[PDB]
Each structure stands twice: as C-alpha cells, then as structure tokens.
Amino acid sequence: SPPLSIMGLMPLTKEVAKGSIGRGVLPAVELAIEQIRNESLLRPYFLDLRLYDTECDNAKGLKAFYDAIKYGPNHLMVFGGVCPSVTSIIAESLQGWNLVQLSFAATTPVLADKKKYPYFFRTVPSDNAVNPAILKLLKHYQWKRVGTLTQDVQRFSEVRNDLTGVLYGEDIEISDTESFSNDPCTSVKKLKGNDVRIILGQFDQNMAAKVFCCAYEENMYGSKYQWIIPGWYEPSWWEQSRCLRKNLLAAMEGYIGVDFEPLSSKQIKTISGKTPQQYEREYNNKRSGVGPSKFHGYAYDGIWVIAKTLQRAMETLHASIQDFNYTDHTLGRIILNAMNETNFFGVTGQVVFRNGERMGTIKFTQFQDSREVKVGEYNAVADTLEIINDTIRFQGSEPPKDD
Amino acid sequence: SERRAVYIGALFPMSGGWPGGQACQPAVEMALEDVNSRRDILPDYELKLIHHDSKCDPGQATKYLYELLYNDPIKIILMPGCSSVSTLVAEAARMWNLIVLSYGSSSPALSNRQRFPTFFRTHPSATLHNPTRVKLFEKWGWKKIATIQQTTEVFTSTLDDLEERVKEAGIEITFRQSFFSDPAVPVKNLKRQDARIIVGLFYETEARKVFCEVYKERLFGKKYVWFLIGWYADNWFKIYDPSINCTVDEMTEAVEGHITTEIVMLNPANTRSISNMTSQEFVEKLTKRLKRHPEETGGFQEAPLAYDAIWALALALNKTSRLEDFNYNNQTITDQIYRAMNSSSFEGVSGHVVFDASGSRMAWTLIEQLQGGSYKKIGYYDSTKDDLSWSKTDKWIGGSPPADDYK
Ligand SMILES: *[C@@H]1O[C@H](CO)[C@@H](O[C@@H]2O[C@H](CO)[C@@H](O[C@H]3O[C@H](CO)[C@@H](O)[C@H](O[C@@H]4O[C@H](CO)[C@@H](O)[C@H](O)[C@@H]4O)[C@@H]3O)[C@H](O)[C@H]2NC(C)=O)[C@H](O)[C@H]1NC(C)=O
Ligand SMILES: *[C@@H]1O[C@H](CO[C@@H]2O[C@@H](C)[C@@H](O)[C@@H](O)[C@@H]2O)[C@@H](O[C@@H]2O[C@H](CO)[C@@H](O)[C@H](O)[C@H]2NC(C)=O)[C@H](O)[C@H]1NC(C)=O
Ligand SMILES: *[C@@H]1O[C@H](CO)[C@@H](O)[C@H](O)[C@H]1NC(C)=O
Ligand SMILES: NCCCP(=O)(O)CC1CCCCC1
C-alpha cells in the first residue's frame, strides 16, 4: 500500500520531563493507527506516522523538524507539538512547507492567532477555554461581582487578559484586579478589604498553597466565599510555611477547579465503534508500564482527525496525492479546508474546530474534605452548563452572595 | 595556488517592521568587494554571500534558515538583521556550531550568552541608552527618577536594565508606570506623585499621545525634564494625528527642553577607517548603489553597522586564518572564530568596533535637547572609556537644570 506520511513531533526521551506526555500518548496513537489500518479506512493507502524527538528544546526541536523534511519521507501534515515555545516556532513556519499541523497537547492561547499561525489546529482546548465555562458558572449562581487573583507569569496573565473580553457585554463586574509575583498575601488582603466574595484565581500549584494560607489568615473562606481556580494541579498537591495543614484544608474547602475534560462521560459509541469507557480500558491495557497521560484521548482523536481529513482530501482530488512535495500550495489548502470540516463524536466528545481551536468540554471540580470531586461540565459547542445534582455543596443554606 | 571560497548565510529584511535589508544588503556587497580586493586581509580566501529576504518575520526566516543549512555550500557564519529573526537564528545556531552576527538587532534579550552562545552584533543593544542616562543624572545631580513606558518587550527589558544601573550609581527609580495604547492614566499619576525627572520609552504614534496628555496636565516647564529616545521623525510633535486633541503650538510647547539619547551609527569625525573611507565617502558610495533615494531606503542609518559587520568577520577570520574544513558537527573552528570575534578592536565606518562579554556592540551615544522646536547637539557619551564630550549648548529656564524634588 502507498504510504500517507505524517510528521510526528513530540518529546519522547526520558531525559526530558515532558517526554512523559509524548510517551504517555503513544499507546493511544498505536490504537487509532492499528484500527484505521485494519478497517482499511484509507484504502488503497495506509497512514505512515514517523516519529521525531523535539526534546522540548527550541534548537533541538527545530533541527528535528529540519532533519525530518531533509531525510524523512514526504510528510502530508504535522502531528504534535507539546512544549509551547517549540510549537510556536514550528507553527509559525508551517506555510513555508504547506504543512497543516494538528497538536493534541499544546494549550498556549498564543496559537489561536490565525494571522501568525494559519496552518495550526489543536484537538485540545487552550488555557483560555476555561473562561466561557466560568462565565456560565457565574450566570448559573447569579454571581455578578467578581475579584481576580493572578500570578505575574505569562501562562496566567494570558488567561486573565482573555477573561476581560469574555465578561465584556455580560452583566458581570470585576470589582478588584490583583496581581502578585512571589507572595499573594498583600493581594489577598486587598481583595478582603474591597469585600470580594467570588475570586477567580490564576496561579500555579506552588502559589496555590500560599494563596489558601493567606485566605485562612484573612478569613477569606467558608459560607461567604467562592474560590474558582485551575483544575490541572497534581492530586495531593497541598501535602507536598506559616499555616498549618488543617488550616490550609479549612481555607481550601469548597474551591472550584476548572480544566479541560480528559474523556467524554457519555456512554455513546464514538467514530471507532467504541464508547469512551471501552477506549479507556483498551488504552490502559496497551500502555503497560508507561505512565498514563491526560492528553491520551486528544492524541487518539487527533489520529482520527488526520484519517478523516486525508479521506476528504482524497475525495477532493478524485472530484477532479503521492507527489506532494512541500511546494504544492493547492494540496495544503485542500488538507486545510478538509480539516476545517471535522465533525465527529470522539473519545473526548464531539471533535469540532472554530478557527483552528477546539470546541470541547470543560470539567468543573470541587475540593471536598480530602480531594477534588467532579461537580459539572461545560459544553463549548452548545455553550451549555450541566451541574451534577447532589455533588456540589456550600457551607451555608444558600450559595454565597457576590457582595 | 587558488583562493578558497568561504560563505556567509545572510538574511535581509526587504519588507516588514524594519525593512533594513534595503540599505544593508548593498552595504554588505560593498564591504565584501572591499575586503576581497585587499590582499592583506584574507589573501588565501574569497568571502562570498548567499542571502534570502526574511521580510523581518521569524516564520518566513525559518524557511530560509533551512535553505541555508540544508543546501551546499557549507556556510561558516549566519548574518540576520531583525531582532525577531536573530532571536530565532541565534538560538537554533548551536545545533550546527555556527557563529551568528547581526547587523540590525537592538533587543536587550539578545545579550544572553546562555541562550545565544555564539551571538555577536555590530548594532548595539537598546540598553546602550542607560549608561548615558545615569551619567546625565549624575552630572545634573538627580537621584530620584520616574519611568514611563509603552508595553513592548524592548521597552520592558530597557527599563529592567536601567534599574540595575541606577542602583550602582546611587540613584533610585521613584515610580514606574506602563500603558499599552492609551497613556492618560500613567501621565496623570506622574503629576499626582509630583515626578520631575521622567524617562519615557515609546514609539512615535504613542509619543504624540504621551505629549498631548503632557500638555493637558501641565507636565512640562521649568520643574520637568523628559528623557526620550532620539529616533523620532524630524518634526514628530507637529505631525497630524486625528487621535490627539492638542494643537501643533500646544504640542511644540509640551516638548520644549526635553533630552534625547541616540545610538551613534556613523562616526561624526572626518577620520579614515580600515577601508580608508571617511563616514561621508561611505554615504556617497552607498547612495550610488541604491535604486531609490536614502529617505525611501529602509535601514539607511544602520547600513554602516552592516558594512562594519563584514569587516569584523573578515578581521576575525584573518586572525584564525583550515576555513574550508568547517563542518556543522564540529566546535573546533567555531570556538576559534568566537575567540577572534570576542577580541575585535578596529575602526569602522560606524566608529570604533568592540563587543562586550554578551557579544553586544559598544558605541558612542548622541545627546540632544529640543530648543525652540528643533534638536540641538548638546554632547556625546562613551560608556566604555567614561568620557563625556560637552558642547555647552544646553539651556534651561532657571539658567541651570531643575531638581528631582519639591525645593
Ligand atoms: C586613503 O585616502 C586617500 C584617498 O584619496 C589616499 O591619498 C592619496 O594617496 C596617493 C598616494 O598613493 C597620493 O598620491 C598622489 O599624490 C602624490 C603627490 O601629488 C603623487 O606623488 C602620487 O604619484 C605617485 O608617484 C608616481 C610618480 O611617477 C605616479 O606615477 C604614481 O601613480 C603614484 O601614485 C599621486 O599623484 C594622492 O595625492 C593622495 N591624495 C590625498 C587627498 O591624500 C591614500 O593613499 C589612501 N590610503 C591607502 C590607499 O592606503
Ligand atoms: C470552515 O468551517 C466553518 C464552520 O463549518 C461547519 O462546521 C463543521 C464542523 C462542519 O459540520 C461543516 O460542514 C460546517 O459547515 C465555515 O463557516 C461556516 O460557513 C457556512 C457557509 O458554507 C455557514 O453555514 C456557517 O454560518 C459558517 N459557520 C460559522 C461558525 O461561521 C467556513 O466556511 C469554512 N471555511 C473554509 C472551508 O474555508
Ligand atoms: C591579516 O593576518 C596576517 C597574518 O598575520 C597579518 O600579517 C595581516 O596584517 C592581517 N591584516 C590586518 C588588516 O590586520
Ligand atoms: N534599528 C533597527 C532595529 C530593528 P529591531 O531590533 O528588530 C526592532 C524593530 C522591529 C519591529 C519594528 C520596530 C522595532
């Protein structure tokens, strides 16, 4: 069978920390490739995924890309890009080789700029995708006044900057905007002073424990308060200086965590004929000793996006592929228009793009006594919120008031 | 015997944010002709140029960087222009053991040896304005300085460097304000906090907005001294902009007396450099090669740095003197060119060429003051030798400069 070559770009080496994402997703990738080949979905052709180690480094990642174009087969598209700076470099240059890229793990909002990154697509929602979800949560609980607490690091300030445009033209007031670099205590005292009740927090796992320490000291917890913070922290992250552990847990009690949903909760058959639950069992058996990655479903659906895209492109050519050097502008545009048509039910839910960006599912969690528990989900396609009955709880008789 | 061809991989921005390659490519071509015609520089070698238009775009540059590295002949050096293109090529370079030499990069971030280990530039860092600023503060006895910037990476980095420089000199930054597009709130705060000595870092469009707000708030006069970058168009404050409320007369009033610092890119002296040209002769020679007038040509003012970049490399290659055996997988020759480039000391058309530990060019600064709607040369400062040339052309209302505080 003639091969349909795809350039796999990701950190794979054990020497690089992010190599766990690349390795954690390969069993999922193997599963989708195996099925597509068995079903002969791409008949007469077959999907040829070639893997190249970026090592999560700008120079090594660029040379890996350059070496793939030079010595590798003729790739039709790019699959991957995990680390934000390496992905930005490759994604900005794509047009030069008429290569469409689909990432499954690069969540940096920067990449949504189609003036800079027109050939870039991602199956994973970006860090900003939590914002239309939070707006729905605020509307649901009648929270019209909010305060913000942001760490002065690009990852977080990007999210806070996006929140401004999401809450604009909506009946929601950001009464207090507070930033911090090393210590949140001064900013937490200012929020308390301005009588903020609903706090939208954007900060890392290390700063989170400091935030909740200050919260306990300033009594910014309990029935009167609602903290809405990142949902992507390690489990038992708080266990890992002035506050006590019991006092941290007391201030942490009831916080809402927000992050993308790793897999669909719907027991409905996907494009592969398996439900998300069946795929998850298949993935856990196949991964063996390799540690699981939360991006696995996004990588699995990613392969299906490529296969379906190649199918549509093959039809477009037949309506009128082998000699695709990186010079064929027309084929690149065909692949680009075919990927824009993507609309199927995958393991991560409905796989659809809005200007290269994934319209997906956002998970809502709540810290309850010892851990984060799922309390809801936001559907970005329908722009709908579903709050799980008899899970979410408030210390008072009613959810807190915003003033 | 025959002369061995040795190749430079260059990127020229013919369009984009800084279309500097328009005047910098002919300047490089002239410099190569000059070095190649001299039998005392590289008699065994012929320096050749292989180039591409980067369009001052990193994405576009990534396609041509590949074209330079993955096609014969082997290049011994990479020559990018724009800071964005240099940030891309100087970071990638270590993977092919390549020296990177920029003729147009101003970004303070490019003076990071950890990240850009083989990087040199004949264009100085935007931080070169800072030692001149600290020296003017010291001369005028100010220890309390306010800073206002437009939000851009270049301005943030320049003010970050100014902080460490003031601390050494026993000077402190009182207040630091920032704005993305509208400077109404930051200027109002400068009046409220009673700021007297102000360093303002912004582009031309934003400078007009700053100075309109400066008129409305009476933040000009005897009490105030503004420090700006001397890179603006001839009568920038008079330039019509419908986004601003203030009139030309009101604006000529607001800008009166302000100080500017500018990087010297052409030796003001009538001396002859290593090519045996004068600064004036180089300008005449370059104008002839150009299809259009210097005013229409991008990078005309930076063109002497591009000319000097070729000589810096030619002299470095002459020290090492072999060259044909250069391979991307070997550090040997690279480390030798590096040491030779690091020890550069010669007279060029832009002035005396030397690099600091970061690989960044050390140059003179031109100090000017706006006196009656016109800039007047009040002096020059040499950061390395700590020597200030004073013109005695500066003027103040009090007959002497004001003070940083209430008194
Ligand atoms: C750098 O800058 C200037 C560029 O204008 C150069 O100065 C010129 O250098 C010439 C010396 O080579 C100098 O020579 C001419 O003037 C002399 C007196 O009029 C005269 O004697 C010379 O003739 C030479 O002698 C024999 C006589 O048989 C001739 O047949 C030869 O052709 C000789 O050249 C020349 O007429 C010229 O006047 C001078 N001009 C100025 C303004 O300085 C300088 O050399 C340059 N340096 C370099 C190239 O290293
Ligand atoms: C790119 O696609 C968009 C959106 O397309 C839809 O969603 C896909 C998942 C799939 O189901 C498609 O068949 C859908 O059409 C296009 O924007 C739409 O354009 C059509 C007109 O043809 C119009 O019905 C819609 O209003 C548009 N949708 C939105 C959200 O604006 C767009 O034309 C495509 N661009 C291309 C091919 O260049
Ligand atoms: C070039 O190097 C040679 C070798 O020592 C030296 O004689 C010559 O003067 C050098 N040229 C310059 C202009 O420094
Ligand atoms: N004197 C030449 C400066 C070129 P630069 O360091 O790339 C910064 C430029 C590029 C974009 C527009 C204006 C600033």
Distance CA B250, CA A111 (A): 44
Of B18, B54, B103, B105, which is best to mutate to test ligand 4, by the most ligand atoms within 8 angstroms of its C-beta?
A: B18
Separation in Å, CA of A184 to nearest CA in chain B? 21
Please count the helices (runs of H) and the strands (runs of E) in chain A: 11, 16
* Closest by Cβ to B70, choosing from A59, A66, A93: A66
Residues A168 and A248 occupy one common structural domain: yes
CATH number of the domain enclosing B114: 3.40.50.2300
In angstroms, what is the span from residue B261 Cα to ligand 3's centroid?
A: 37
CA B276–ligand 1 middle distance (angstroms): 13
Nearest to B62 among A59, A70, A92 (CB): A92
Rg (CA), chain B: 22
The Å distance, Cα B43 to ligand 3 centre, comes to: 9
A337 and A316 co-located in one domain: yes
Shared-domain flag, residues A259 and A148: yes
Q: Is B109 on the interface with A (CB under 8 A)?
A: no
Q: Which residues of B sit in the known binding site for 4-aminobutanoate?
A: 83, 106, 123, 203, 302
* B77 close to B36: Cβ distance less than 8 angstroms: no
Ligand 2, closest atom to CA A352?
9
Amino acid in position B254: A
Residue B396: CB atoms within 10 Å:
13
DSSP state letters, A167-184: HTTTT-EEEEEEEESS--
Q: Where are the beta strands (DSSP E) in B180-313?
A: 197-201, 225-229, 259-263
Residue A326 forms contact with B (CB below 8 Å): no
Q: Give the DSSP letter of residue B116.
A: S
Whether the CB-CB separation of A239 and A209 falls below 8 Å is answered with no
Please tell me the distance between residue B348's alpha carbon and the centre of ligand 1 in angstroms: 22
* CA distances for A316 relative to A121, A313, A326, A336, B186, angstroms: 20, 5, 19, 12, 56
Number of domains in chain A: 2
Whether B403 and B353 map to the same domain: the answer is: no
Nearest CA among B122, B109, B147 for reference residue B264: B122
Give B275 Cα–ligand 3 centroid separation in angstroms.
Answer: 14
Q: Which residue has the tokens 């600091």?
A: B356
- Residue-wise DSSP of B312-342: HHHHHHHHH--GGG--TT-SHHHHHHHHHHH
Whether the CB-CB separation of B221 and B397 falls below 8 Å is answered with yes
Number of structural domains (chain B) is 2
User: Do B115 and B130 belong together in one domain?
Assistant: no
CB B305 within 8 A of CB B350: yes
Q: Nearest residue CA, atom 37 of ligand 2?
A: A337
DSSP3 helix / strand / coil % (chain B, rounded to 5): 35, 20, 40
Q: Does A74 touch chain B (CB under 8 A)?
A: no
Does ligand 3 have an atom closer than 6 angstroms to the CB of B41? yes
Distance from CA of B339 to the nearest CA of A (A): 23
Closest ligand to residue B270's CA: 1
B152 and B78 in a common domain? no
CA distance A354 to B145: 48
Domain that includes residue B190, residue range: 125-268+364-407
A140 and A51 housed in the same domain:
no
Q: Which letter, b or e, does each residue of A51-74 get, where b requires 16 or more Cβ atoms within 10 Å of its Cβ?
A: bbbbbbbbbbbbbbbbebbeeeeb
How many CA atoms lie less than 13 Å away from A351 in the CB half-sphere?
Answer: 31
Q: Whose CA is nearest to atom 11 of ligand 3?
A: B41
Method for this entry: X-ray
Domain boundary among B363, B382, B399: B363
Give contacts of A70 with chain B, Cβ < 8 Å. 70
Smallest Cβ–Cβ distance between B95 and the set A63, A70, A92 belongs to A63
Are A150 and A276 in a shared domain? Answer: no
* Residue A159 near residue A141, CB atoms below 8 Å: no
- Same domain? For A377 and A260 the reply is yes
B352/B289 same-domain check: yes
* CA separation, residue A159 to residues A162, B40, B315 (Å): 5, 60, 50
Cβ of residue B82 lying under 6 Å from some atom of ligand 4: yes
Any CB–CB contact under 8 A between A393 and chain B?
no
**Number of Cβ atoms within 10 Å of the Cβ of A155:** 16
Q: Is the dihedral of CA B26, B29, B34, B37 positive or negative?
A: negative
| Whether residue B225 is found in the same domain as residue B146 | yes
The protein residue with its alpha carbon nearest to ligand 3, atom 6, reads B40
Interface test with A, best of B66, B72, B100, B112 (most A CBs within 10 A): B66
> CA-CA distance, B321 to B227, in Å (whole number)?
46
Strands (DSSP E) found in B166-213:
172-179, 197-201
Interface test with A, best of B52, B55, B62 (most A CBs within 10 A): B62
Inter-chain touch B62–A60, beta carbons under 8 Å: no
A78 and A23 assigned to the same domain: yes
Which CATH number fits the domain that encloses residue A378? Answer: 3.40.50.2300
Same structural domain, A346 and A391 = no
Task: List binding-site positions of B for baclofen.
Answer: 83, 106, 123, 203, 302
* Closest residue on chain A to B84 (Cα): A89
Of B63, B91, B95, the CB nearest to A96: B63
Nearest atom (ligand 1) to Cα of B276: 1
- Pair A256, A136 in one domain: yes
| Residue in B274, B275, B276 to alter for ligand 1 test, most ligand atoms within 8 A of Cβ | B276
Same domain, A42 and A76: yes
Report how far residue A288's alpha carbon sits from residue B146's, in angstroms, rounded to the nearest whole number. 61
Between the CA atoms of B225, B228, B230 and B235, what dihedral angle is there, to the nearest 10 degrees?
A: -70
Closest chain B CA to residue A88:
B59
Nearest C-alpha neighbor of A190 from the set A207, A178, A173? A178
Residues B65 and B161 in one domain: no
Q: Are A348 and A361 in contact (CB under 8 A)?
A: yes
**Would you say A261 and A361 are in contact if contact means Cβ atoms under 8 Å apart?**
yes
Across the interface, whether the CB atoms of B95 and A62 are under 8 A apart is answered yes
In terms of domains, do B144 and B220 share one?
yes
Closest atom of ligand 2 to A337 CA is 37
Nearest Cβ partner for B62 among A59, A96, A116? A96
Q: Which residues of B touch A69 (CB under 8 A)?
A: 66, 70
Q: Tell me whether residues B93 and A89 touch, CB distance under 8 A.
A: no
CB contact under 8 A, B93 and A63: no
Nearest atom of ligand 2 to the alpha carbon of A342 = 9
The secondary structure of A360-372 as a DSSP string is -EEEEEEEETTEE
> Is the minimum CB–CB distance between A93 and chain B shorter than 8 Å?
yes
Helix H or strand E segment including A38 = helix A19-38
Owning domain of residue A16? 1-125+266-360
Residues of A within 8 A of B109 (CB-CB) are none
Distances, alpha carbon B231 to alpha carbons A241, B12, B126, B236, in Å = 50, 21, 12, 10
- Which residues of A are less than 8 Å from B69 in CB distance? 66
Where b means 16+ CB within 10 Å and e means fewer, B73-111 reads eebbbbbbbbbbbbbbbbbbbbbbbbbbbbbbbbbbbbb
Using a CB–CB cutoff of 8 Å, tell me whether B176 touches chain A. Answer: no
Angle at B107 (CA atoms; ends B342, B127), nearest 5 degrees = 75
Same domain (yes/no): A348, A380 = no
Looking at beta carbons, which residues of chain B come within 8 Å of A177?
none
Which residue ranges have their beta carbon within 6 Å of ligand 1? B 272, 276
> What DSSP character marks residue B374?
S
b or e along A305-338 (b: 16 or more beta carbons within 10 Å of the residue's beta carbon)? Answer: bbbbbbebbbebeeeebeebebebeebbebbbeb
Whether residue B106 has its Cβ less than 6 Å from ligand 4: yes
Whole-number Å distance, alpha carbon A309 to ligand 2 midpoint, is 15
Compute, in angstroms, the gap from residue B100 CA to the centroid of ligand 4: 17
Nearest CA in chain B to A69: B66
Claim to verify: residue A132 and residue A234 sit in the same structural domain: yes
- Provide the 3-class DSSP secondary structure of residue B376: strand
CA-wise closest residue to A106 among A123, A118, A92: A123
Question: Which residues in chain A touch residue B96, judged by CB atoms under 8 angstroms apart?
Answer: 63
Distances (CA, A) of A204 to A151, A247, A249, A369: 8, 20, 17, 21
Answer yes or no: is the C-beta of B152 below 6 A from any ligand 3 atom.
Answer: no
Residues B152 and B217 reside in one and the same domain: yes
8 A C-beta contact, residue B184 and residue B243? no
Are the Cβ atoms of A116 and B66 closer than 8 angstroms?
Answer: no
